Design a protein around this ligand. Structure first.
Ligand SMILES: Nc1ncnc2c1ncn2[C@@H]1O[C@H](COP(=O)(O)OP(=O)(O)NP(=O)(O)O)[C@@H](O)[C@H]1O
Ligand SMILES: Nc1ncnc2c1ncn2[C@@H]1O[C@H](COP(=O)(O)OP(=O)(O)NP(=O)(O)O)[C@@H](O)[C@H]1O
Ligand SMILES: [Mg+2]
Ligand SMILES: [Mg+2]
Ligand SMILES: [Zn+2]
Lengths: 61, 611, 97, 193, 197, 177, 616
């Protein structure tokens, strides 16, 4: 079956991807001026892992 | 001694269960994959056995006949552990060996090798029927009626001389109902022609294989064997006994398929190379230049040899009428024109072929001969060159020097694709579906181009009509062509052409013998193309023009033509039209194939008749 | 091909172009051979092999000889006003070998 | 269509890896990120951020497996294998499997997937010698494959029960079990009036 | 009889279904059977002429209660069958064009009928309308292989010189190697400029 | 009536519906002689035609006495039922009909047959055991596999291709990244 | 003891359930009681359906197939104990009471993986019930095998007996009884052997060879030796295509005996035959239903039939309507007259096609070879005069001088297809005269002096001596053969491939349609693995027209035959040619399904002969 769409869940996640992707860019402006880079690497690879689940979800439906 | 065998067995169970490269337990996985498809065997590569524990390879190679049957039981014990639930049967597994030990030339086998694992190679000249060896005798006493059994392993045991518990001196009979048996086959292997010493006849071994190695070869195949060089006490000198090989691993060199009902033995890593190659827009240029790359010119003869290697398509009507799919070609011509060098090439590219000389041949040696077996004293039938070449090409060189009684035996095997026999109370029609490629000279050696074109040619219209393309290969003395040949031939002797043929293969302008042999073998199994309805409108409008042309040429010449056009030659142009569609793996034949098939027929049989 | 009197199945016996393999075969009075005998040489001149298919034996022997032949012209004497192809009873496929 | 044919009704093994990488795993950090009372910070949105900003070298902690593998790719972590990846606990499960033909043992849903990930990425972090662990993971893989082949003799129009089968062991069988039970159902419902 | 042209169209449909799944790449779908389809559409027109030529002959009196009850119904069933073969063939070729439009043109035109050259354009325009909107933050035409991989070594397989991409600049010198974040190079890997992973 | 699991656009259902079944006509009918390959004649009662299943399935239902009887087809004759019941694994169904299972389901719908539904449910379940062995067995093909895939229907080839790629992709993932 | 006695009651319950086996036993028992005792005799054998047995007890059925030496013996005991419960007869004779004549089983249908051929039969099949399909060769001579000796003890009046055991008599192994009669009793009385109360069974060994059509590429046909006994003996002859069911079994010690040192030889293996079914389609005859009979009779009324049937011969070959007409009359051959004073007159039409290359001479021989009920192919180079006639041999079972049949003897009451007929050696053509004149061959070699029947019709093909027919030369210049041998043929057709724009277009379109054929169920490009009749109906029509009709020559046809004979002869025609006219007229009367040769048959015979003579 085509299951019913998670309306409020999807609006929430598409906010957090927009806010988090702005945050990763803002933190990359501090690096122009400790200064350890693992949390930047994790915040970026988490958005790739999350954007994949939503793309794979929408492409499926 | 059985403490010692139990340690040898335990050490090989642990080879199967522990041997790993990368993440994968390659012998546990191979056992399970073989159990599911139900072949109870394991192939072991001996570099891995040396890599695990060299003491085991030492034990194995010191006395194979006593250690191979201990590794077979170690395989069965693992086979139970990995495929049956304990505390909730399989036969004795075969061990098959692969090796890269140095090949011993077949004539260098001597007393130094008795009982050793020996790797070698040769041409299979014969295969026997299958025979049954026991692996388990059920047993009962004649007198007291005690009952037991004997497990048998077939290296280098017999019925016991004592009742085991007066009961008598030879007490036991075999209960056939409860006994179990295995297949055994005898081969004979001749040595490779390029390894025979000067002036000697090629030497021969008999050898035996059993279980999953039986039926894995056919006469004429070139093979490498791993086996135990060993001895048997034949009744056929003093203190003397006959050598043979217990075969432990046949390995056919080119994946020549053996006894094979067209089954899908190819692998996706080569099938996807062929399925790209089919779709190359230049494919017919590539295959034409890959035929005999050291032979200059002869472009149409190469184009026709490519058609002959594919053949057309075989058909079977609701009438029951069978149509020939195989293409036959005649190279009739002047001396030193590469006719025999092209026959010696088609013998190597074709997946099955036989080269023969018509002067070195007989009717019986070509077709099938009645032999008398010295033991039964019965007659039996043996296949000649046409039966050995079945499903392939027979190359008949010196076809003009064949006797008139011998050439006629070929007439059935070129059209109806059978060899009929009625001799010594044998009667059969044997199947023999081959292309014939033949080479000949005219009467008077050269073509003598001023003389009547029928007075140059010896052959009757009965045999000439059985050839789909006849090439009258004239040599013409044009100085620009002779310089173009002279430069080319010198580049062969001086070793330049070797590097050019390597560079053209790397450039993709040419393909190797091994690749081409496997491409031909694939096209014969994936395509049998039909004519499109529009291809018939062209081939009909053409063939009636070819007959009008012939009738006019006969009216000038005041006689029946010696090279004929007949309806067997319409079917030649149809069959060529299909061969060109098999090259590119087309499911159908089209107006572009019909144009090239009419062109090749014009450049061969019709320009040969026009002389 | 020989048939044994005892085991009485077929085998190969090698001729002069096998017994001279990596060597020479010397053919005296080559013009006076029968044409049926003389034309057996055509494979062993160029391909340096002997391809038999007789009595269910189908195989190829090696035959890498040099052949030296001696002959007389037609009529027993050379006649210097004629072309070679008229001085000799041979033909282009064997003369070119 | 929008979704490739080989994904239309099942997961790829790489998607079954991606699902298993979302689980918590215990680690020993080789970095102290914890700030003293007497700097960049993680700020994640799919997992608990409060575990990573509080690492202290060699005191164990739990993190999501895809972060443990990303830290272990540098020298910056070591991955503590679960208790069931011990030669004792694997050998109790092998004994259970042999003892109960009728059932699969209570291995966790991800056991093949997690064994394959950690034997490649965390090969040095096992207390037992990894060649005996690979050996027993294979011993378990093979016994469960026999029990699966016994189970397929019972394909049915109504249902099956497959209690402790792994996600990777379900995912190889899915396009066979469901495709055959679908044709057994079509042949059955066709017979009904 | 009339369905026998339809069966040849669907045997070509089946062969292109096999072709496109067996071969590992995106193959170019084979050329549209404009001729077989014109034969089928011509036969449907003759079945229409037979419905007209029957429907009048009912009033002229030729035992229509039996005769038309069967003849109309069989003529109609032949046209249902020809519609199904044409639609089954045209839907399969549609499924492959949508697969191209996501897989490749999301990031051979001689073979397509003019309606399919048009449809493929309108469907590529629909794909870009979905990703150009809300849901823009995720590149819907992007990869369905999960991001198990963070940085990757990539070997540059064809020369392409200095090129821009949204995230940065690379000089794609033949047989140089980069170690770079997978998310930056993934579209260049798909275009086949890069090798590894 | 039609069942939703076999689709309109489903090519192997379009092809299955194309296969001919033997049919006896129960009426005289003018104009329909094109079914007998002669348009000029009428159809005559007790003519024994072979009609495609997409025509025969519908003519068997309407006319009570309908236009056609379906005669029992060769592929569901007692000979084939006996061969199915002795050795399901050895049987060469691809020679009996390339679409045998799709056609079996259509025949079991068209006449409710608990008897044929049992025989075909068993044939499927027994051949499915071998389909799993040949799909599971991965080389590091054999004759003993290739001799079975040649005995194999256009329905069971989908299940084989799909199951084999499922085992193969799992091996491909376990034994390299 | 224990499991045998259960399997007996388990099979007894099957025979009680499927009552058609009691009915079959009853039918045999009353027929033998009528013809032997009350007044040609039926065997004590029952063919069971293996499908009835599968559905009654799958565990007995799988025992019969996989362990037959443990399940056929108790099943034959159960059937024998049934027949003895049914049997009633007053005052039975001593040979009946002494007979050792139990009931034997035979099997139908559905062997599954146990259906095999001589090549696929393998050591994994030993001790299993198998069906094998092949061509029969080398049938050995029949010999009586001793299985019980009865003895009479003079000075006591007791009849003793002994039973005998051999590895081919029984499915289970027994200690082999040494073939020596008791000479003296247990007590010491002299024993006399009672032949006629003693029991012997007929025994024969046959070789079944793989069908050459099925043999894989470049491999020669394999074979199995089959043992046949009691009532299966002579149910086959060499050249029969056959399906044999039997237990595949091993024999001997196989070199496990210290009398031999070889260690490479294997056990001997045989099939003990339980039943034999003959075949001829590529099933030895068509059984004809009341519907087949209705169709054959109704079709014979249509005046066009001689065209309908002859066009339905070889429909892929274009033209040659007059040769295909002569082939139809050769198949429905004329009537033989066994006249007194040795005056036997042949019924059999002989056809020689001599002609240009590529005219379907060989493709019409290969049609005759397919459609005829018995046909033997030969070719001129492939045939010895020995292998055409009969060859001397030793029968390896018995050590004795024997004849093997040649192609002209195997083809008795059938057709011989001799291709390449002009390529036969002069010594081999001597053998063809005897068959064509005297329908027999005479053997005088090895101390065998005999006459064999060879009552066959020769169809033959040849080319003229110059490879195409030279119209500037006589028939006796063009055709290689002695005019004596040419007089033994009825219809010497001469055929040419002559250029004509309309005919060459017409045959060209026909072969291009013929090459476009797609066999049903194959895909495009996949490799192979107003009136006409289908060939399986034409085979039924020909069989009916030979088993049902024997036309009588009649004055209406005589008034035509002598009119046309005297016209032909008064402007090569000889006394033999009058008998050809009578054969063609008698053959055509069979095509019309009629008991009398009418004026129409004599006219069609004269036109068809005048075509072959004049090339009309
Ligand atoms: N066109 C060519 N290109 C290259 N080599 C050639 C060519 N023509 C002849 N030769 C060489 O010259 C020799 C020709 O001998 P061969 O190929 O046996 O001639 P042939 O045509 O069979 N003549 P023949 O046996 O006399 O009728 C071989 O060594 C060839 O390689
Ligand atoms: N009239 C024809 N109609 C159709 N095919 C024909 C016809 N005549 C000959 N052929 C084809 O020509 C080919 C040769 O026929 P075949 O019977 O082998 O020739 P043949 O007359 O016996 N000639 P030959 O063997 O040389 O003496 C076969 O493929 C035939 O089907
Ligand atoms: Mg040469
Ligand atoms: Mg012929
Ligand atoms: Zn004893």
């Amino acid at each position: 079956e085509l299951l019913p769409y998670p309306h409020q869940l999807m609006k929430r996640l598409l906010n957090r991807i927009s806010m988090q992707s702005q945050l990763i860019e803002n933190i990359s402006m501090g690096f122009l001026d400790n200064e350890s880079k693992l949390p930047l690497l994790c915040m970026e690879t988490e958005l790739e892992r999350l954007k994949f689940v939503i793309r794979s979800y929408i492409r499926c439906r | 001694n059985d403490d010692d065998n139990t340690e040898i067995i335990k050490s090989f169970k642990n080879f199967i269960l522990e041997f790993r490269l990368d993440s994968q337990f390659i012998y546990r996985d191979q056992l399970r994959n073989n159990i599911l498809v139900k072949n109870y065997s394991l192939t072991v590569n001996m570099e891995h056995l040396i890599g695990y524990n060299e003491d085991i390879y030492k034990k194995l190679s010191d006395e194979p006949s006593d250690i191979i049957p201990l590794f077979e039981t170690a395989i069965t014990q693992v086979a139970k552990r990995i495929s049956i639930l304990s505390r909730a049967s399989l036969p004795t597994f075969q061990l098959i060996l692969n090796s890269n030990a140095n090949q011993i030339p077949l004539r260098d086998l001597d007393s130094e090798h008795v009982s050793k694992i020996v790797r070698l190679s040769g041409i299979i000249i014969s295969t026997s029927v299958l025979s049954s060896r026991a692996t388990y005798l059920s047993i009962m006493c004649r007198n007291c009626r005690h009952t037991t059994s004997i497990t048998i392993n077939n290296f280098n045991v017999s019925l016991p001389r004592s009742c085991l518990s007066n009961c008598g001196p030879d007490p036991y009979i075999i209960i056939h109902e409860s006994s179990k048996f295995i297949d055994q086959q005898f081969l004979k292997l001749q040595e490779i022609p390029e390894l025979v010493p000067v002036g000697e006849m090629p030497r021969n071994l008999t050898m035996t294989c059993d279980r999953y190695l039986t039926n894995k070869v056919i006469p004429g195949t070139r093979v490498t064997i791993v086996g135990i060089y060993s001895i048997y006490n034949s009744k056929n000198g003093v203190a003397i006994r006959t050598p043979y090989i217990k075969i432990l691993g046949i390995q056919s060199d080119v994946e020549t398929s053996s006894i094979w009902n067209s089954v899908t033995m190819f692998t996706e890593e080569e099938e996807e190379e062929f399925l790209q190659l089919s779709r190359n827009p230049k494919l017919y240029e590539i295959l034409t230049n890959s035929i005999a790359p050291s032979i200059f010119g002869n472009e149409d003869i190469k184009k026709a040899i490519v058609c002959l290697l594919m053949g057309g398509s075989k058909k079977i009507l609701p009438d029951g009428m069978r149509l020939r799919g195989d293409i036959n070609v005649l190279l009739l011509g002047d001396p030193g024109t590469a006719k025999s060098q092209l026959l010696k090439f088609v013998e190597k590219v074709s997946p099955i072929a036989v080269y023969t000389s018509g002067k070195g041949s007989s009717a019986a040696g070509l077709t099938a001969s009645v032999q008398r077996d010295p033991m039964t004293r019965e007659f039996y039938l043996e296949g000649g060159a046409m039966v050995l070449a079945d499903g392939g090409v027979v190359c008949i060189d010196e076809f003009d020097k064949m006797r008139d009684e011998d050439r006629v035996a070929i007439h059935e095997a070129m059209e109806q694709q059978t060899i009929s026999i009625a001799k010594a109370g044998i009667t059969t029609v044997l199947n023999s579906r081959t292309s014939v490629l033949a080479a000949a000279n005219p009467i008077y050696g050269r073509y003598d181009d001023l003389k009547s074109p029928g007075d140059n040619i010896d052959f009757q219209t009965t045999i000439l009509s059985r050839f789909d393309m006849i090439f009258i290969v004239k040599d013409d003395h044009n100085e620009e062509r002779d310089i173009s040949i002279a430069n080319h031939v010198i580049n062969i002797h001086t070793g330049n052409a070797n590097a050019m043929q390597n560079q053209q293969e790397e450039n993709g302008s040419e393909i190797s013998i091994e690749k081409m042999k496997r491409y031909i073998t694939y096209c014969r199994l994936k395509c049998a193309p039909r004519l499109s309805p529009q291809a018939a409108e062209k081939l009909s409008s053409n063939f009636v023009t070819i007959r009008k042309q012939l009738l006019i040429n006969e009216l000038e010449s005041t006689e029946r033509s010696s090279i004929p056009i007949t309806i067997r030659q319409l079917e030649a142009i149809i069959r060529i039209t299909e061969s060109l569609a098999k090259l590119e793996l087309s499911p159908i034949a089209q107006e572009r194939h019909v144009d090239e098939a009419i062109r090749l027929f014009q450049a061969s049989t019709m320009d040969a008749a026009s002389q | 091909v020989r048939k044994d009197p005892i085991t009485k199945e077929w085998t190969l016996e090698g001729g002069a172009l096998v017994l001279a393999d990596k060597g020479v075969c010397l053919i005296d009075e080559f013009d006076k051979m029968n044409d049926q005998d003389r034309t057996s040489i055509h494979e062993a001149m160029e391909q340096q092999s002997i391809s038999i298919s007789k009595a269910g034996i189908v195989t190829t022997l090696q035959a890498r000889c040099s052949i030296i032949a001696a002959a007389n012209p037609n009529g027993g004497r050379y006649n210097s006003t004629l072309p070679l192809a008229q001085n000799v009873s041979l033909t282009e496929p064997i003369l070119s070998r | 269509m929008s979704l490739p044919a080989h994904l239309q009704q099942t997961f790829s093994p790489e998607e079954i890896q991606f699902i298993v990488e979302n689980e918590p795993i215990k680690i020993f950090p080789r970095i102290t990120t914890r700030q003293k009372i007497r700097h960049t910070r993680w700020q994640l949105i799919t997992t608990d951020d409060k575990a990573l900003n509080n690492m202290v070298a060699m005191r164990s902690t739990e993190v999501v497996l895809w972060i443990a593998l990303l830290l272990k790719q540098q020298s910056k972590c070591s991955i503590v294998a679960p208790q069931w990846l011990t030669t004792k606990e694997l050998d109790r499960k092998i004994q259970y499997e042999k003892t109960h033909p009728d059932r699969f043992s209570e291995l966790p849903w991800n056991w093949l997937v997690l064994a394959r990930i950690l034997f490649n990425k965390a090969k040095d972090d096992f207390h037992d010698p990894i060649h005996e662990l690979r050996g027993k993971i294979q011993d378990l893989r093979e016994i469960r494959q026999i029990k699966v082949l016994k189970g397929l003799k019972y394909l049915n129009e109504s249902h099956l029960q497959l209690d402790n089968l792994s996600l990777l062991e379900i995912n190889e069988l899915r396009p066979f079990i469901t495709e055959i039970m679908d044709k057994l159902r079509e042949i059955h419902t066709a017979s009904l009036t | 009889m009339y369905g026998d042209l339809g069966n040849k169209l669907v045997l070509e449909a089946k062969r292109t279904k096999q072709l496109y799944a067996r071969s590992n790449q995106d193959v170019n779908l084979p050329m549209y059977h404009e001729d077989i389809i014109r034969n089928i559409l011509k036969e449907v027109s003759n079945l229409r002429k037979n419905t007209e030529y029957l429907k009048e002959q009912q009033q002229l009196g030729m035992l229509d209660d039996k005769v038309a009850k069967c003849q109309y119904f069989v003529t109609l069933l032949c046209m249902e069958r020809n519609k199904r073969c044409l639609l089954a063939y045209q839907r399969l070729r549609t499924d492959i064009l949508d697969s191209m439009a996501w897989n490749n043109n999301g990031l051979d035109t001689n073979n397509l009928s003019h309606q399919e050259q048009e449809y493929l354009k309108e469907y590529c325009d629909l794909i870009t309308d979905l990703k150009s909107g809300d849901l823009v933050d995720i590149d819907l035409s992007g990869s369905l292989v999960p991001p198990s991989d963070v940085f990757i070594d990539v070997r540059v397989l064809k020369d392409a010189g200095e090129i821009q991409t949204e995230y940065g600049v690379f000089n794609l010198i033949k047989d140089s190697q980069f170690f770079v974040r997978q998310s930056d190079v993934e579209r260049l890997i798909q275009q086949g400029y890069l090798q590894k992973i | 009536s039609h069942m939703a699991s076999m689709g309109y656009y489903d090519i192997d259902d379009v092809l299955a519906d194309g296969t001919e079944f033997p049919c006896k006509f129960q009426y005289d009918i003018p104009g329909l002689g094109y079914l007998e390959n002669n348009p000029g004649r009428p159809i005559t009662k007790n003519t024994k035609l072979s009609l495609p299943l997409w025509l025969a399935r519908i003519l068997a239902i309407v006319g009570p006495v309908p236009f056609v009887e379906l005669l029992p087809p060769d592929m569901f004759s007692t000979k084939v039922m006996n061969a199915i019941k002795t050795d399901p694994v050895a049987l060469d169904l691809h020679s009996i009909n390339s679409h045998f299972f799709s056609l079996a389901i259509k025949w079991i719908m068209l006449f409710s047959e608990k008897e044929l539904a049992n025989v075909v449910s068993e044939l499927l379940l027994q051949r499915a055991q071998e389909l799993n062995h040949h799909a599971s067995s991965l080389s590091i093909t054999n004759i003993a596999t290739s001799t079975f895939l040649l005995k194999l229907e256009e329905m069971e080839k989908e299940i084989y291709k799909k199951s084999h790629e499922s085992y193969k992709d799992t091996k491909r993932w376990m034994f390299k990244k | 003891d224990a499991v045998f006695g259960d399997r007996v009651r388990r099979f007894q319950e099957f025979l009680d359930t499927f009552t058609s086996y009691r009915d079959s036993v009853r039918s045999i028992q009353v027929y033998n009681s009528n013809n032997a005792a009350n007044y040609n005799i039926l065997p004590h054998r029952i063919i069971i359906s293996l499908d009835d047995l599968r559905e009654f007890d799958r565990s007995f059925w799988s025992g019969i197939l996989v362990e037959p030496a443990y399940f056929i013996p108790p099943a034959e005991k159960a059937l024998t104990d049934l027949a003895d419960s049914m049997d009633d007869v007053p005052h039975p004779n001593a040979s009946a009471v002494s007979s050792r004549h139990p009931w034997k089983l035979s099997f139908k249908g559905s062997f599954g993986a146990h259906a095999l051929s001589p090549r696929t039969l393998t050591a994994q099949h030993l001790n299993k019930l198998v069906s094998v399909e092949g061509i029969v060769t080398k049938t050995s001579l029949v010999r009586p095998k001793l299985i019980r000796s009865v003895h009479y003890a003079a000075k006591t009046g007791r009849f003793h007996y002994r039973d005998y055991t051999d590895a081919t008599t029984t499915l289970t192994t027994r200690i082999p009884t040494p073939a020596i009669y008791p000479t003296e009793d247990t007590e010491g009385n002299k024993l006399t052997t009672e032949y006629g109360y003693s029991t012997f069974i007929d025994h024969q060994r046959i070789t079944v060879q793989e069908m050459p059509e099925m043999a894989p590429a470049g491999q020669l046909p394999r074979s199995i030796d089959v043992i046949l006994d009691d009532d299966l003996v002579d149910k086959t002859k060499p050249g029969d295509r056959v399906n044999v069911v039997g237990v595949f079994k091993s024999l001997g010690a196989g070199g496990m005996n210290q009398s031999n040192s070889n260690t490479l030889i294997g056990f001997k293996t045989l099939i003990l035959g339980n039943t034999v079914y003959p075949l001829h389609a590529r099933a030895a005859r068509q059984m004809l239903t009341d519907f087949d009979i209705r169709n054959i009779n109704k079709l014979s009324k249509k005046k066009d039939i001689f065209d309908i049937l002859s066009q339905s011969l070889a429909p892929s070959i274009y033209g040659h309507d007059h040769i295909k007409k002569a082939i139809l009359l050769m198949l429905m051959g004329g009537v033989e007259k066994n006249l007194e004073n040795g005056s036997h007159l042949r019924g059999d039409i002989n056809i020689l096609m001599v002609g240009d290359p590529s005219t379907a001479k060989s493709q019409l021989l290969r049609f005759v070879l397919n459609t005829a009920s018995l046909a033997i192919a030969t070719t001129g180079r492939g045939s010895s005069g020995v292998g055409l006639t009969a060859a001397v041999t030793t029968d390896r079972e018995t050590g004795e001088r024997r004849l093997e049949a040649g192609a002209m003897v195997l083809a008795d009451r059938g057709v011989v297809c001799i291709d390449e007929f002009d390529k036969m050696t002069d010594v081999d053509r001597v053998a063809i005269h005897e068959v064509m004149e005297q329908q027999t061959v005479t053997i005088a070699k090895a101390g065998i002096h005999t006459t064999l029947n060879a009552r066959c019709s020769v169809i033959a093909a040849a080319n003229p001596v110059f490879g195409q027919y030279d119209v500037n030369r006589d028939p006796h210049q063009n055709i290689a053969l002695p005019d004596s041998l040419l007089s033994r043929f009825d219809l010497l057709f001469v055929v040419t491939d002559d250029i004509n724009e309309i005919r060459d277009r017409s045959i060209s379109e026909h072969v291009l349609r013929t090459h476009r054929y797609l066999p049903p169920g194959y895909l495009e490009g996949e490799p192979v693995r107003p009136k006409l009749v289908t060939i399986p109906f034409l085979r039924k029509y020909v069989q009916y027209a030979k088993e049902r009709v024997i036309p009588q020559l009649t004055q209406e046809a005589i008034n035509v035959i002598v009119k046309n004979y005297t016209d032909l002869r008064n402007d090569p025609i000889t006394a033999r040619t009058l008998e050809t006219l009578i054969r063609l007229a008698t053959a055509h009367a069979k095509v019309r399904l009629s008991k009398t040769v009418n004026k129409v048959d004599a006219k069609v015979a004269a036109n068809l002969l005048r075509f072959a003579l004049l090339g009309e």
